[PDB]
Design a binder for these strands. Structure first.
Ligand SMILES: [Mg+2]
Ligand SMILES: [Mg+2]
Ligand SMILES: [Mg+2]
Ligand SMILES: [Mg+2]
Ligand SMILES: [Mg+2]
Ligand SMILES: [Mg+2]
Ligand SMILES: [Mg+2]
Ligand SMILES: [Mg+2]
Ligand SMILES: [Mg+2]
Ligand SMILES: [Mg+2]
Ligand SMILES: [Mg+2]
Ligand SMILES: [Mg+2]
Ligand SMILES: [Mg+2]
Ligand SMILES: [Mg+2]
Ligand SMILES: [Mg+2]
Ligand SMILES: [Mg+2]
Ligand SMILES: [Mg+2]
Ligand SMILES: [Mg+2]
Ligand SMILES: [Mg+2]
Ligand SMILES: [Mg+2]
Ligand SMILES: [Mg+2]
Ligand SMILES: [Mg+2]
Ligand SMILES: [Mg+2]
Ligand SMILES: [Mg+2]
Ligand SMILES: [Mg+2]
Ligand SMILES: [Mg+2]
Ligand SMILES: [Mg+2]
Ligand SMILES: [Mg+2]
Ligand SMILES: [Mg+2]
Ligand SMILES: [Mg+2]
Ligand code: NA
Ligand code: NA
Ligand code: NA
Ligand SMILES: [Zn+2]
Lengths: 90, 71, 255
RNA sequence: CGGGGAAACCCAGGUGGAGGCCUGUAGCGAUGCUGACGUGCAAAUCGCUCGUAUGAUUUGGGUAUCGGAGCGAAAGACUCA
RNA sequence: CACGAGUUGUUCGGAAACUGAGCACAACGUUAUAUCGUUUUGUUAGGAAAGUGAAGUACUGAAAAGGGGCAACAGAGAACCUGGGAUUAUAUUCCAAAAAGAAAUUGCAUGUGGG
RNA sequence: CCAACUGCAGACCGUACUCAUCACCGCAUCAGGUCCCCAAGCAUAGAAUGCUCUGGUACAUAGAGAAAGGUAAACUCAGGGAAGUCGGCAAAAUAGAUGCGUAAGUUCGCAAGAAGCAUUGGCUCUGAGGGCAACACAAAUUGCCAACUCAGAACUGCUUACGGCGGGGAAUCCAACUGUAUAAUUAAAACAUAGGUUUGU
RNA sequence: GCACCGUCUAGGUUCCAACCGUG
RNA sequence: GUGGUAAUGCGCCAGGUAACAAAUCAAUCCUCCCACGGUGAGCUUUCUUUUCACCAUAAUCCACCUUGGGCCUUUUUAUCGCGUUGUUCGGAGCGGGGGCUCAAGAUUGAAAAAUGCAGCCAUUGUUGUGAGUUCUGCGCAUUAAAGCAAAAACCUGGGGU
C-alpha cells in the first residue's frame, strides 16, 4: 500500500517546518538520492557521494558536477556552444 | 599476498608478499595485461604516422622540385 | 564603552579559519616556458570534496619538465570532468572543456572559469560553485580582453592571462532550503566561528551603538558615513539608497 | 507480491528501519511544595515532584583569546567564594 | 605516637625514536627601550645555513632547494607466557642446573652449508 | 655474500599504599564535588524496581521510655464533595498487557494512549508454528530429537489483595517548532532559529 | 658618408641559391 | 633462479601498510542455563534415584576440514536466471563441471602432566545442548550545503648496477 498521500521522503519531518519549504526541498532530495545514467557504461549507475561528486557503481568512474543532479541545464548549453566553436576553429 | 603487520612483514620471506609475474605485489593481472596491450598498440600506431610523414617528405624530394626543375 | 564584536574579530583569536581537514590551496600550474611556447598534457587522477567548499577539486598528474619525477596539481574542477580524462595546458591547446588557454586564443562569446586577473597569478576570478565569466571582445592594438564577471561588472585584462574552459561544478547549491538550526551549525563548522548571530538592538549600550532603551529600537538613522571610525561604522555603511528595489536592479559595487 | 484498468494510473498485503520523533534508565539539568534546614551536613545543601535523554548531546587530557581588556544562542552573564 | 623494616624488569609504562592543535631559538625587522613582531597555505633568513658515502692508511672532495628544536604515560609505536609450599609487607620484576620451566627478540663474533 | 646453528652481552628512570560516607578539593575523618576497566541468580520488556550465592559490613554516642508542640523519602477516616483559598496549593485520582472503538480541526504528517467498552487467577487437556538420517513422478513416508511462543476447551476460586506504572474534556492570550539562558530569590511572552529584506565590495 | 662590433636556425616553398618565417 | 594453459606455486622513481563512520544480520573467546556421568559435602520424624560445590590446560611451534570473499579455465545465458533479514547481480561473462588464492575458524601433534584441584601413598578427573556477549566477518553506500588526521618506521616493484 502507499503509506503516504504526497509527503514521500519528507514524512520523516512529521509536522515541522511548513508545507511550502518541505515541498520545495523534496524535489531536490529525490534527485539527490536517485540513480542517474552513465553514458560510459550504458546503465543507470551514478550515485552522489558528497555535494558535486558522482560515482559509478560498476565502473570506476567519478564525475564532477551538479550538486543535486548529475548535469545542470546551463552546462549542456555550454557543451554545445564549445563544440560548435571548436568546429569553426578546426 | 598475505596480510602482515610490521615485524611479521619484516621477518617473512619475500614471496609471501609478491608473485613471480611482472609488477608482482603492486598490480593485478588484468591491469598488467592492459598495460602490455596498450604499450604495444600505442608504439605501433606512432610508428605508422612517423613513417607516413617521412614518406611524404621523401615523395616531395625527386618530385616536381627535382622533376619540374628550373635552376 | 567596550570593544564592538566586529572590531574584536580583527585580532584573530578564536575567529580564524578552521583548516585542519582542508587539502592545500587550489591553483592552476605555474606559467613556465612549456606553457608559454608549447603545451603540456596531464591526466585526471581523482575528484574529491574538501570541507568548507561547495565546488569539487581535481588532482591532476603531469611530468616534471626538468627532472625525472611526477608532479601533482590540485585545481577547482569544471562541470563534466571525469577520472582518466586528458587535460591540455598551454599556448597551442584545443578548445575543449577543462583545457587551459591564454585568453587571447579563446573566441569571443566563450564561457570560462578560473581566470587570472594578472598573468601568472594562477587563477583568482570565477571560482565559486556554478560561476563563470563571459568573453566579450579582444583588442589586438593594446593586447587586452574584455570580460563580463559573475557580479555583472565588466573588466579588462591582459590577453596573456589564462583561463579554463567551462563552468565551476556543484551549481545550484543554494536552492535547497536549510530548514533547521542544526544544518546551519554543520555548515559553518567547516568554515569558521561566525554563527549564530545576535542582533545589535538586543545588546546593551556599553557594547553596541544600537543597544539599550525601554523598547528595542535604533534611535538614530542606521545609514552611517564612509568616514566613521571603527566602532561607529555599523549598520548600512555608506548606502546610496535603502528600501525595496523596484524596476531594474542596478549592478552593485564601485564605479 | 495480489486485484482493477484501453491508457494514465488506482486499491490492498508484506519487507525495511528514517526522525534536532514519543514513553523511560545512567548521564546532563532544576518546575512546584513558596516542604526540610535557616548559630545548617553545607559561606546554596537535603527530600519528593519535575525538564531532556541520537543530538545545535554529555565528558577526560592537551592547546588558543584577558583588565577600559577578554568571552558571550545577550542575563551587564562569566573571567579561581 | 615510638622503634625496626619493605618497592628487584632485554620483553610492563616512559625515554632513546613519530607526527597534531600549537610554541618560538636562530635569522631579519621594529622600538628612546627587546622584556616586541614574523616563524606549516611545503616550511626560516636580500638568503653563500648541505662537511658526505664512494672511489682513489687516515686524509681528500662530486651529487641531495627550502636552519635547529620542543609539544600525546588514552592518537601512531611497542621482542613474554603460565606454575610456585615464593613475603610480615613486592612480583607477567623474585625462583638455579632437572634454572618449575617453555619462548621471542637486538648487537657483535665462530663455524657449518651454500654464493 | 646469504640464511640458519652456535658463543657472549642485553644500559637508564618508574614500581610501597590510596583513589574516597576517613588517604584528593571544600579551614575538618564535612549527607557537597571528582575521569577509566571487570559485573552473578530469580521475578520482569528491563542496567526500572524488590529479594538472594561469592566478595564486603554491623561503622556512624548510647540507655530508659505514652506529656504538649514539631519533622516524616508515614497511614486511615461516617455523611457531604472545593462550600476552603488570591488560586484545587497540597493530597486524592489514572495506571500493565490484549481485542474492539475513536470528534472538531489540519501545513495531510497528525490531532491519538483522543474519548470510551470488554477480558486477565489456578488446575487438567487439545491444536498450530521445526531440524537431519534413510523421464520418473503419493520418500505426498519411516525413525530420532530440541526450543519456546501463541490460540481454544473443561473443571475450580477471589477478602479484587507485592513491586512498578498516563487522570480526562471545552476554550481564550503569547511564542511557530527542538534548543539557550540571570553559578546563590526571575526558565519567561526574553535570546537563538529556518525563512524574508536591505547595504558595502 | 664608409668600415668594424655583425652571426646561426626548424619549417614553407621554388642541385645550389633566394623569399617567407622566427627559435 | 625456477614450475603451472591460467588464477598463481616453490627455493633514483612508483605504489602499498601504518590509516581511521553508521545501522542490520551472523558472531568467536568468555559468561550463564540445561542433559548425562565421576568425586566430596548437606538434609533425613517423615519425604526427597535428592540439594550444593568441583570436574582446569598459558604463550610459542608442526602438519593440514568448514564458512565467507576475489579470481582462472572449460561448456556459452535472456524475455530469462542466480542471491540476501535487508535497500541486486549478469555477453564489461549468469549458472553448472573442475581448479587458484585470501580471511577466519577447526583438526593433528610438540609444549603437557613432570602442572593445577579435591578427598586420602594411593583414587579422581567431562563430554553434549540452548541464551547472552563487538573480537571478527558481512570490505570500504549512516544525516550530509557534515563525507570522517598526519608522520616516523616498514613492505613490494621499475630501473640500472
Ligand atoms: Mg590558519
Ligand atoms: Mg537585555
Ligand atoms: Mg555608545
Ligand atoms: Mg520588536
Ligand atoms: Mg527527542
Ligand atoms: Mg524522555
Ligand atoms: Mg538590564
Ligand atoms: Mg607517624
Ligand atoms: Mg604545527
Ligand atoms: Mg623551522
Ligand atoms: Mg616529542
Ligand atoms: Mg598509545
Ligand atoms: Mg614497553
Ligand atoms: Mg599489596
Ligand atoms: Mg603494587
Ligand atoms: Mg576506584
Ligand atoms: Mg565526604
Ligand atoms: Mg584534604
Ligand atoms: Mg538499579
Ligand atoms: Mg461527586
Ligand atoms: Mg470559593
Ligand atoms: Mg470564602
Ligand atoms: Mg498539585
Ligand atoms: Mg485507552
Ligand atoms: Mg518557544
Ligand atoms: Mg523547550
Ligand atoms: Mg537565579
Ligand atoms: Mg529558578
Ligand atoms: Mg525573539
Ligand atoms: Mg559495527
Ligand atoms: Na521554602
Ligand atoms: Na535489575
Ligand atoms: Na470522609
Ligand atoms: Zn559507469
Amino acid at each position: 500500500a502507499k503509506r503516504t498521500v504526497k509527503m514521500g521522503v519528507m514524512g520523516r519531518y512529521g509536522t515541522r517546518y511548513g508545507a511550502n519549504p518541505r515541498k520545495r526541498a523534496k524535489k531536490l532530495e529525490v534527485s539527490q538520492h536517485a540513480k542517474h545514467f552513465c553514458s560510459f557504461c550504458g546503465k543507470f549507475a551514478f550515485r552522489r557521494k558528497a555535494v558535486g561528486i558522482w560515482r559509478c557503481d560498476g565502473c570506476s568512474k567519478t564525475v564532477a558536477g551538479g550538486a543535486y543532479t548529475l548535469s545542470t541545464p546551463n552546462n549542456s548549453t555550454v557543451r554545445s556552444t564549445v563544440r560548435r566553436l571548436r568546429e569553426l576553429a578546426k | 599476498t598475505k596480510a602482515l603487520r610490521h615485524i611479521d612483514a619484516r621477518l617473512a620471506s619475500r614471496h609471501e608478499k609478491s608473485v613471480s609475474r611482472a609488477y608482482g605485489g603492486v598490480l593485478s593481472h588484468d591491469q598488467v595485461r592492459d598495460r602490455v596491450v596498450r604499450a604495444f598498440l600505442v608504439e605501433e600506431q606512432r610508428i605508422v604516422k612517423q613513417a607516413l610523414k617521412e614518406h611524404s617528405k621523401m615523395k616531395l624530394s625527386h618530385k616536381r622540385t627535382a622533376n619540374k626543375k628550373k635552376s | 564603552g567596550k570593544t564592538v564584536l566586529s572590531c574584536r574579530k580583527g585580532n584573530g583569536s578564536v575567529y580564524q579559519v578552521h583548516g585542519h581537514k582542508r587539502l592545500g590551496p587550489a591553483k592552476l600550474r605555474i606559467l613556465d616556458y612549456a606553457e608559454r611556447h608549447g603545451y603540456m598534457r596531464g591526466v585526471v587522477k581523482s575528484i574529491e570534496h574538501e570541507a568548507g567548499r561547495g565546488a569539487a577539486l581535481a588532482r591532476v598528474e603531469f611530468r616534471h619538465p626538468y627532472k625525472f619525477r611526477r608532479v601533482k596539481e590540485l585545481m577547482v574542477a569544471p562541470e563534466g570532468m571525469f577520472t582518466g580524462q586528458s587535460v591540455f595546458c598551454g599556448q597551442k591547446a584545443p578548445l575543449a572543456i577543462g583545457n587551459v588557454l591564454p585568453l587571447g586564443q579563446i573566441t569571443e562569446g566563450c564561457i570560462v572559469c578560473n581566470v587570472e586577473a594578472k598573468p601568472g597569478d594562477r587563477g583568482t576570478l570565477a571560482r565559486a560553485s556554478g560561476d563563470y565569466c563571459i568573453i566579450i571582445s579582444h583588442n589586438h592594438e593594446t593586447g587586452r580582453t574584455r570580460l563580463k564577471l559573475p557580479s555583472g561588472q565588466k573588466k579588462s585584462v591582459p590577453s596573456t592571462s589564462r583561463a579554463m574552459i567551462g563552468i565551476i561544478s556543484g551549481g545550484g547549491r543554494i536552492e535547497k532550503p536549510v530548514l533547521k538550526a542544526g544544518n546551519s551549525f554543520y555548515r559553518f563548522r567547516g568554515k569558521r566561528n561566525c554563527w549564530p548571530k545576535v542582533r545589535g538592538v538586543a545588546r546593551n549600550p556599553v557594547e553596541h551603538p544600537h543597544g539599550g532603551g525601554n523598547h528595542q529600537h535604533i534611535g538614530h538613522p542606521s545609514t552611517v558615513s564612509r568616514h566613521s571610525p571603527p566602532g561607529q561604522k555599523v549598520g548600512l555603511i555608506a548606502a546610496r539608497r535603502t528600501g525595496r528595489i523596484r524596476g531594474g536592479k542596478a549592478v552593485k559595487g564601485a564605479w
